[PDB]
Structures are given as C-alpha cells and as structure tokens.
Amino acid sequence: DTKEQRILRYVQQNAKPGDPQSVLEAIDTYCTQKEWAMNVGDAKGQIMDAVIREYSPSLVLELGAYCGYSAVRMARLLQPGARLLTMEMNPDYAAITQQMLNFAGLQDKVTILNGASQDLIPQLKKKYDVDTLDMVFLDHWKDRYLPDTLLLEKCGLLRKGTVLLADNVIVPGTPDFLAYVRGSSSFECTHYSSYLEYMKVVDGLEKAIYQGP
Numbered sequence: 001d002t003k004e005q006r007i008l009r010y011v012q013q014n015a016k017p018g019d020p021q022s023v024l025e026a027i028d029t030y031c032t033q034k035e036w037a038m039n040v041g042d043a044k045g046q047i048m049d050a051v052i053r054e055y056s057p058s059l060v061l062e063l064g065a066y067c068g069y070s071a072v073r074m075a076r077l078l079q080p081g082a083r084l085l086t087m088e089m090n091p092d093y094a095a096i097t098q099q100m101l102n103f104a105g106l107q108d109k110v111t112i113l114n115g116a117s118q119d120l121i122p123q124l125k126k127k128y129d130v131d132t133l134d135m136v137f138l139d140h141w142k143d144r145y146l147p148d149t150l151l152l153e154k155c156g157l158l159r160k161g162t163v164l165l166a167d168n169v170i171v172p173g174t175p176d177f178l179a180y181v182r183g184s185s186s187f188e189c190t191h192y193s194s195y196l197e198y199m200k201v202v203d204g205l206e207k208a209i210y211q212g213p
C-alpha cells in the first residue's frame, strides 16, 4: 500500500465516523508518530481556521487536496449551505480525499474534482455554475500558484474582497507568487509565520485579498 492508503486506514480505525475533529486528530497523530506527510498540519491549520472563521466564506476553491486534511479542516467550519470545491490532479489522491470526506461526514459540502486546475478553472462558471469565489486555498504544485492566480483573474472568478490563502510560501516556497502579490496594487497581503507540518522548520501562509483591477 501507499502512505496515503495507510493514512486513510488509520483514520478509519482511530477516528469516529462523522466527527471531523477526530479525523484531523487521527491524521496529525499518524503523521507525528508514524510517517510524515504533506498535510497542512495543526500549526498552520489553526491559522487557516482563524481565517475561515473571520470570513465565513460561502464558496471556497482549494487547489490541491492531497488526502483531504485541509478540505476537512475548512469544510467543518463552513456555515450550513456553504460549499467547497477542491481540484486534485492525482487520481489516487482524489480517491483518498473522497473517502476521507465521506468518513468525516462532509461529502455533501465538498465536491472533489479530479483534473488539472488550469483545465478546470475555465469551466467553473459554465459547468459548475460559479459566479465569483469568496476564498481560494492554494496548496498544489508551488510553481502553479502564480499562473493559476492570474488565470482566476482572467476568468472573472475573483471579486473585491476574495481571500487567497497560500500554503508553503517559505518551504518549499513560492517565490514568484509571493513577489507578485506583495508588489501588486490589486492585492492586500499579510504573512502568517508558522511551521512546516509536523516539523521544527519555519514555514508560513500568505493571505492576499483581491482588490479589483
């Protein structure tokens, strides 16, 4: 089996069905005690939670699901009727994520789309009936943060006040994205220093609020 299969099995055997908090705790225990994995983790996860609670977004897009940790984290705090769309290009990861969300009881709030973000973003309006996004969580390949942000804008998916929240802006890092948003009058940026998941290594999140053209 793979590491992601191992993590899902551990959650299924160490968490309570329909209890998202127990799911998160199980994943964090596994990844601290058994094997590291690229989930956002509890340190950065607490900062994500604080942001979600501040903005109460009605429609969130996540780029990169992995095993579903961040999707569980966000979707458990959404208000009734609010929704998360997550784009996962790796089909094996998409399948893990779906099963993680099903176990957490969050499946009705989340739609996991298996494909490349650059292919799916242009379909969001016409195929998925999206108008504009309240929040975007970036956690996919780090060289894709900037091109996909510029694509979201092109496609008319950002509105005044759309919150972008980007993982891993220090490790592995996303230097083009970070320079861009920090230099642009169309974004208001805040850096949240933290730690790499499950490690004593500095990392951070960047929040960039879109201000229009």
Ligand SMILES: O=C(CSCCNC(=O)c1cc(-c2ccc(F)cc2)cc(O)c1O)c1ccc(O)c(O)c1
Pocket (backbone or CB within 6 Å): 038, 039, 040, 064, 089, 090, 139, 140, 141, 142, 167, 168, 171, 172, 196, 197
């Ligand atoms: O699209 C994907 C993968 S997106 C994963 C991006 N995320 C990361 O890489 C990521 C990495 C690190 C990290 C790694 C090593 C370190 F030493 C330190 C940090 C941490 C994070 O929090 C991350 O989010 C895909 C498609 C098709 C495929 O066949 C496939 O295998 C994969």
Ligand SMILES: [Cl-]
Pocket (backbone or CB within 6 Å): 038, 039, 040, 041, 065, 066, 067, 068, 069, 070, 071
């Ligand atoms: Cl994650």
Ligand SMILES: [Cl-]
Pocket (backbone or CB within 6 Å): 040, 041, 042, 043, 044, 196, 197, 198, 199
């Ligand atoms: Cl952590």
Ligand SMILES: [Mg+2]
Pocket (backbone or CB within 6 Å): 038, 039, 040, 139, 167, 168
């Ligand atoms: Mg990450």
